[PDB]
Design an enzyme around this catalytic site. Structure first.
Site, PDB file in Angstrom:
ATOM      1  N   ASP A 192      -9.931  -6.574  -9.141  1.00 11.62           N
ATOM      2  CA  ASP A 192      -9.325  -7.267  -7.794  1.00 11.62           C
ATOM      3  C   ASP A 192     -10.427  -8.146  -7.238  1.00 11.62           C
ATOM      4  O   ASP A 192     -11.146  -7.801  -6.698  1.00 11.62           O
ATOM      5  CB  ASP A 192      -8.881  -5.838  -6.922  1.00 11.62           C
ATOM      6  CG  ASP A 192      -8.634  -6.376  -5.560  1.00 11.62           C
ATOM      7  OD1 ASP A 192      -8.279  -7.719  -5.537  1.00 11.62           O
ATOM      8  OD2 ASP A 192      -8.228  -5.519  -4.770  1.00 11.62           O
TER       9      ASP A 192
ATOM     10  N   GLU B  84      -4.632   1.298  -3.619  1.00  8.33           N
ATOM     11  CA  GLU B  84      -4.376  -0.091  -4.246  1.00  8.33           C
ATOM     12  C   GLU B  84      -4.422  -0.161  -5.437  1.00  8.33           C
ATOM     13  O   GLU B  84      -3.298  -0.501  -6.337  1.00  8.33           O
ATOM     14  CB  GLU B  84      -5.345  -1.231  -3.333  1.00  8.33           C
ATOM     15  CG  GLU B  84      -4.893  -1.607  -1.984  1.00  8.33           C
ATOM     16  CD  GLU B  84      -6.079  -2.001  -1.046  1.00  8.33           C
ATOM     17  OE1 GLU B  84      -6.972  -2.383  -1.689  1.00  8.33           O
ATOM     18  OE2 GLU B  84      -6.040  -1.912   0.179  1.00  8.33           O
TER      19      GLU B  84
ATOM     20  N   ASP C 276       1.362  -4.155   1.198  1.00  9.78           N
ATOM     21  CA  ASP C 276      -0.164  -4.336   0.522  1.00  9.78           C
ATOM     22  C   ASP C 276      -0.437  -4.736   2.055  1.00  9.78           C
ATOM     23  O   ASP C 276      -0.392  -5.946   2.334  1.00  9.78           O
ATOM     24  CB  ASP C 276      -0.045  -5.289  -0.295  1.00  9.78           C
ATOM     25  CG  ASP C 276      -1.973  -5.667  -0.701  1.00  9.78           C
ATOM     26  OD1 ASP C 276      -2.726  -4.942  -0.109  1.00  9.78           O
ATOM     27  OD2 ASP C 276      -1.988  -6.782  -1.441  1.00  9.78           O
TER      28      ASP C 276
END
Ligand SMILES: [Zn+2]
Length: 381
Positions: A197, A173, A8
């Site tokens: 998120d 993502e 990530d």
């Protein structure tokens, strides 16, 4: 033989995971941290990456680079780049309409493309994985925001190759977070998944439809006024005000005092998710004055109540754009450090009329976890 890693590559922090021994393991760095700052600092004698770089940002603001993800794959004249530039302490220059970060390194002026800076963060993530595995890593899956365009994706891949990684795939993502929770393992029949998120460089809400393992982005929404730093600013202002009616002194103009208080607040925010209290203990904050204090979680959840409440507007918008009712969302997935804040979970759960949340994977690790699963799938292990 060697496992591939999932990375990530975040705006503020990055995280690396690997599938081995039948499970995904998120890897801690040498300071024991499960996420690493996406920071690179240049000094008179060395190049620091991750924790070491973030740790000396107050002593070296002009040569400590961060936010490279905001520049990656963009043109110098991009209005986003032009606007962000007035807020960074480091210099960005124009080179063939491509931006480069310019710094002082070992006594001389040097400039780096955004992918070069991100390649250094990726090299650190790669090394973190190698220290843990005990062997060389040559393959990886790297994630990017669903809204990244081809140029941003290319430059991210380039950063990975510069770091010595064969980039198996660049995946979104929110997709990675869904994969982490095994939401793409069913069969035929659409499933609607909402990824919330919060805590990173920006607040992103994504709604995906998954059908027989195929992902489609139905809507994306967000709020750039709800980055993790915006919650930190609230804490900073709170303590600046506290310090002021205690010492009758305003530290807001002392750039160093404000930096350390910022650092303390971020630290405080985190522990407030697990604690009902957080302590601040800064020696010689301003004019030698020490600042030891603390904040309670509902003073905090209160201090930020409007910001947390604001996260639901992009959710409502995304549902409207995806043309779905709340009841049509099959799964809610948490990503980002701030989603572990109790108030935030309550707001999302209440907004969805009591729905439980997919939150068993640390939210700030879910994206890397999913990238790690995908990497293993692509390797055939
Ligand atoms: Zn906004």
């Amino acid at each position: 033989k060697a496992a591939a890693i999932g990375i990530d590559l975040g705006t503020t922090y990055s995280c690396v995971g690997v599938f081995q021994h039948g499970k995904v393991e998120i890897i801690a760095n040498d300071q024991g941290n499960r996420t690493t700052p996406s920071y690179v600092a240049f000094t008179d004698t060395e190049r620091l990456i991750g924790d070491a770089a973030k740790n000396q940002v107050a002593l070296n603001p002009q040569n400590t680079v961060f936010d490279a993800k905001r520049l990656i794959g963009r043109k110098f004249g991009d209005p986003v780049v032009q606007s962000d530039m007035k807020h960074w302490p480091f210099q960005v220059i124009n080179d063939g309409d491509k931006p480069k970060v310019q710094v002082s390194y070992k006594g001389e002026t040097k400039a780096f493309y955004p992918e070069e800076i991100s390649s250094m963060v990726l090299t650190k993530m790669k090394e973190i994985a190698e220290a843990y595995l005990g062997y060389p890593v040559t393959n990886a899956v790297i994630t990017v925001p669903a809204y990244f365009n081809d140029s941003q994706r290319q430059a991210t891949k380039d950063a990975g190759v510069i770091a010595g990684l064969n980039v198996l795939r660049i995946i979104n993502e929110p997709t990675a977070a869904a994969i982490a929770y095994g939401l793409d393992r069913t069969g035929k029949g659409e499933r609607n998944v909402l990824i919330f998120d919060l805590g990173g460089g920006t607040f992103d809400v994504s709604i995906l439809t998954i059908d027989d393992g195929i992902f489609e982005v139905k809507a994306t929404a967000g709020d750039t006024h709800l980055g993790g730093e915006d919650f930190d600013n609230r804490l900073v202002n709170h303590f600046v005000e506290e310090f002021k009616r205690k010492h009758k002194k305003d530290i807001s103009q002392n750039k160093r005092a404000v930096r350390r208080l910022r650092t303390a607040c971020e630290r405080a925010k985190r522990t407030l998710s697990s604690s009902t209290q957080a302590s601040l203990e800064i020696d010689s904050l301003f004019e030698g004055i020490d600042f030891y204090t603390s904040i309670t979680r509902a003073r905090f959840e209160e201090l930020c109540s409007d910001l947390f409440r604001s996260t639901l507007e992009p959710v409502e918008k995304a549902l409207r754009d995806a043309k779905l009712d709340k009841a049509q969302i099959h799964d809610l997935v948490l990503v980002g450090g701030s989603t572990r804040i109790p108030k935030v979970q309550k707001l999302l759960q209440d907004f969805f009329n009591g729905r439980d949340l997919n939150k068993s994977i640390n939210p700030d690790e879910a994206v890397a976890y999913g990238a790690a699963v995908q990497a293993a799938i692509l390797m055939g292990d």
